[PDB]
Amino acid sequence: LKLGNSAIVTQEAANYCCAYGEWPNYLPDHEAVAIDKPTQPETATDRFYTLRSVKWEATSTGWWWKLPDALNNIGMFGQNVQHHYLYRSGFLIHVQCNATKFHQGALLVVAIPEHQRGAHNTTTSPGFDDIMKGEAGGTFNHPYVLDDGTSLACATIFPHQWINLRTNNSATIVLPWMNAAPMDFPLRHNQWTLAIIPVVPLGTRTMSSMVPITVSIAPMCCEFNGLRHAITQ
């Protein structure tokens, strides 16, 4: 299953979320008016980059990875992120958890457009260290407020699936480009923010026995700007 990349993820039936009902796509007529030489429809960059499995406990509150914060500094996406000024990509969010049938829990897989997350009880803006986290990503110190001043009770209006462990352990959110910009710089900006937020703590008769939440992201229809341009003629 999901054989359209250089790396596959074998799982159960797909049940994808068409994020806002739309699929990823490249530049249409917007290519001529945007920054030129965008031609590279980078397919080795579409490798299914599985992030390291964050550890679901009952005492845990949540996790987040911003979509250019993740997948940069590693792989083809990371290398083209350093070599390339600007890019466009949808993201195939795929969230798995090897949780047993006996395990108890709900999990709001929510991908947030522009999660401009605030700090807690400090009026200053969050900076490079507490925004650009990376591969492991940050944890929701206040998942009920979504670290933004918003409410988690209305986080589902965003593109979202639901890991109710009694019925599914798989999420698939097929994110579009999601920017005001047609193409945007991956260094200075994040278009999406995957958020693994348990609205139910992980439940076992033991001390919430171990499940891992393995998160796998493939940049679908990933399109950078072209360094190799014929500057002649």
Next chain:
Amino acid sequence: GVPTYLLPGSGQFLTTDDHSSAPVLPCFNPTPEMHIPGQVRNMLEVVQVESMMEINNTESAVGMERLKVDISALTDVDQLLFNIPLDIQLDGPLRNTLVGNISRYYTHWSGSLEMTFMFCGSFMATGKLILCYTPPGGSCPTTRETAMLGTHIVWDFGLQSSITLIIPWISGSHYRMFNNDAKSTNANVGYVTCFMQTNLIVPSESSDTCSLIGFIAAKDDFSLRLMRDSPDIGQIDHLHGAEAAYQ
């Protein structure tokens, strides 16, 4: 010259007018409007999608675990598990929801809501659970016996993970019928309750305190009218970022 007279009201500034004024800085083509996904043309498709409620009405449970309710083996049979009122602009589960927050921008919010519960237990966490909805005209149920008399459904979550409830024609508004008193009159127009049809039973290796969440959405007949300022956030008037754009 065209003979015109100034009407009573000419030269006034109405804040709710559709008069197109003079475009300042002209002949400027903006950034050309491209198809950004997720286009919002109406507030209805905002509230037509599901959104969780603050189902735990206990004030001790605040923050995270107020979006969920705990069902254990010691929670017994014929006990009121949640007592969600179907009223928007008063304190309760219908406060930080999508429909409640968008309809807090409006006075009248007549329509129908589509409130959805999923059980969040183990795969074989089986238990019969009766959900009773009561109309605006009637008393709130306290037992399973008076829950059975009203319009109710029996949701056994042994095999079905998410249950889906359709609510007929909730209609509430904001009333200021008192002469300049600003009483902020409210309305009670429904309740959705929960009772335990049997004991929730679990395997010994799984957790006994099995949890439950729920969502609420709206249908196409849900509609809003007469927009107002939402009193969720007041004017703080001493924000730190303020007086910096003013510099």
Next chain:
Amino acid sequence: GVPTYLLPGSGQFLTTDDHSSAPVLPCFNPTPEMHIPGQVRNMLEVVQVESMMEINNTESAVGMERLKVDISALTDVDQLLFNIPLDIQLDGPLRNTLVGNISRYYTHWSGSLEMTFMFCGSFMATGKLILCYTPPGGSCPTTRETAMLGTHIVWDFGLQSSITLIIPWISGSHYRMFNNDAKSTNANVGYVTCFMQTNLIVPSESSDTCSLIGFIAAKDDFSLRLMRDSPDIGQIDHLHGAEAAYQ
């Protein structure tokens, strides 16, 4: 009489309006408009023609010999000969050019430039010379080895006198994102560099210090938007010819 009301904004003077006013001194036929050559209908055909740059970035070379760069027999192999940045509104070669000066009247200047170099040596002044253009995302090259990795052309001017470079989609603007700070934020959106592929060799009777100039133009996709006052010349406010028309 036609019943009119004064709109909010009536009677104001906008400096960017297209309102045709009352023609003072009427029934006066002007001098009838004859076909003067070189008619300018747009600023694009102004910047579409070639114009030299201040290629010598050394501040010691000012005035005349800053439009040209000297290549001698002692300038050796694998040396950075010019380091032209492809940015408009900062100090460098792209300051007193046509495109730079016209796009200094505007904030946004996205498009493509057509920058042309001709060698100005002797007829048999032969030398291989590598021109490397770098995209906005990337570091400036310092050697021939890192010039070869980037998008580059090798221009031997032994037989070809003028070389013609096409630059894909340079896009820069003026940014004032800071709240009332007037920082005048700039942008770096490219570089065009020069390196010596081999030693420039000349006959003994000809000059060894062979010079090189270059031009820059624009294509049809080059365009400007949101006009502003050009800060090339400020208000001096004590001009000698002033207060004489005021007499």
Next chain:
Amino acid sequence: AIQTRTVINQHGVSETLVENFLSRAALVSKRSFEYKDHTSSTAQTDKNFFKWTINTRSFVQLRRKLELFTYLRFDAEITILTTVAVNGSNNNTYVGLPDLTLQAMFVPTGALTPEKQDSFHWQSGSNASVFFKISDPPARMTIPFMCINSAYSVFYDGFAGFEKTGLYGINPADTIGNLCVRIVNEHQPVGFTVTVRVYMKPKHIKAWAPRPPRTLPYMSIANANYKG
């Protein structure tokens, strides 16, 4: 605590459109700047002219209204209602309120924001200005969509640049303009405390990616920090 209910017919859908929902001219910025004759330059860059970067986050109710949606495109109809007030006293019958005019000049991104009421940026010409009076109706300028991307990022998950500190949520784009309002007249012998109450009505509104609203009170304009 009276509990009453009414039956609402309510056969309308157009009142919940995004265009009608955000197209209300709400108070987005207001302060009183002290125009009274400054022989000595005291409290500079804010005394004799009204400067405010055009942002919807300055007032809380309208702010929470526009951060219901992630991406917004609107031509902000700016209605500028200036009411002067004479500070001090001259007589008891009528102090005399002149029909003084104001230059409500709009300074976009890439343009020089004025730093005093008599700076050379007021006479730039490139940045468009309206000249309106107190006795006139308030200045209704509908500024167009000023953003180099196609929507206003009322959240921007990122920084203005890869370096410095404090640019989170600060788009290099958007930055709708610097609404700079002065008094064109040279300083009268009597002073006025003119408060510029400017109202923004977003027009031709398209919203994208709708969001949960803000639930705890705000703490800063530039960020979305919270008191949890």
Next chain:
Amino acid sequence: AIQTRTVINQHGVSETLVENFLSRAALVSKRSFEYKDHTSSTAQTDKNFFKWTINTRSFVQLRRKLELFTYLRFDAEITILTTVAVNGSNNNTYVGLPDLTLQAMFVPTGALTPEKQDSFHWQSGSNASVFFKISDPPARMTIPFMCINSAYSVFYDGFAGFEKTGLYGINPADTIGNLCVRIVNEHQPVGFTVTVRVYMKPKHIKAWAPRPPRTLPYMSIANANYKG
């Protein structure tokens, strides 16, 4: 020294037209003339009326804008924004600002330019005048193309005549007019320092033979001398 870049879509060509590029009403001349009651004729030919020969070279930014092109034909829409100001003090409540009118009379070539506010040239009739007030909107006169050749020589490589000295760049043609603004009212007991800020918006603009812009600062209106 923050370095940020944005992607601009920018699918427009009409914003770089010559008509839009020079058709901005920019401040071309402004001074305050002392209208206050002259029992003694002091500082004559400039005290009680505003005289300015209509030329685009008086202000530097707009000057460098129109000497981007050699030959220009435009009907100069002249918008005259006069703001009076009472010099001195009378009371503390309201000094009283009268709705005095002004004759913003346009004196072309071959016509007598007035030398005082009560000269007989103000009542000539042949040279067209507008009568507008302070409480009125500013006087928008669109004067036509006043040149005996078919374009305005913003450079004229030559002299007004084969003799005299100092006529280089002085076209016998162009000489668009003498914008002469007075106060029609007889001298009030209280005085006003009225500053006439006239804005020129060139209209129906055709440009010919486009040029390099000016790069060193200007030193005189009449010539193009430079500080090299």
